[PDB]
Design a protein around this ligand. Sequence first.
Ligand code: HEM
Length: 152
Amino acid sequence: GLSDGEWQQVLNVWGKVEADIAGHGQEVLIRLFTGHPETLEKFDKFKHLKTEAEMKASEDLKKHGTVVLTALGGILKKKGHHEAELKPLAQSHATKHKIPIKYLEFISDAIIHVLHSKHPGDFGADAQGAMTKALELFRNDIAAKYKELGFQ
Ligand code: HEM
């Protein structure tokens, strides 16, 4: 649960992502895959990528980065009222993609990392705190649906 002050910070930070959604999306996925190579194995269409150069040169990775961040952004803009938006994602990720919640933790931290990297000195403590809380909320609501499904 975030205050309106914190949501305002979240959506302000998100304005940065939206000025270049593909670049941000790409770098988030690269940070995930290089930081936690086991995550790469969940994507049959990215598992072929072995090097970060190949990742960087992949237009399809950028495209998926756009899909992922577009979805997260739509969820963030709901300011916590995202049951309708989140439920199909939780279901697809638990039942089809089989993504354990740990990996959602991974990508959460990766987003924080990328924002600092692309906006050094421009991602303040208050903004990081708000964004972190937002991603925790997201994760926690997914986790609840995972439990429902008995998914580990
Ligand atoms: C902020 C977190 C995430 C968001 C917003 C998100 C969103 C999405 C969306 C919208 C899709 C396409 C629709 C669907 O299949 O449901 C998708 C597909 C997929 N996602 Fe996620 N995702 C997230 C995190 C992750 C993570 C951390 C992993 C794995 C480590 C992952 C693995 C996959 C896979 C394997 C697909 C199918 C890709 C394909 O074959 O086209 N997702 N995701």
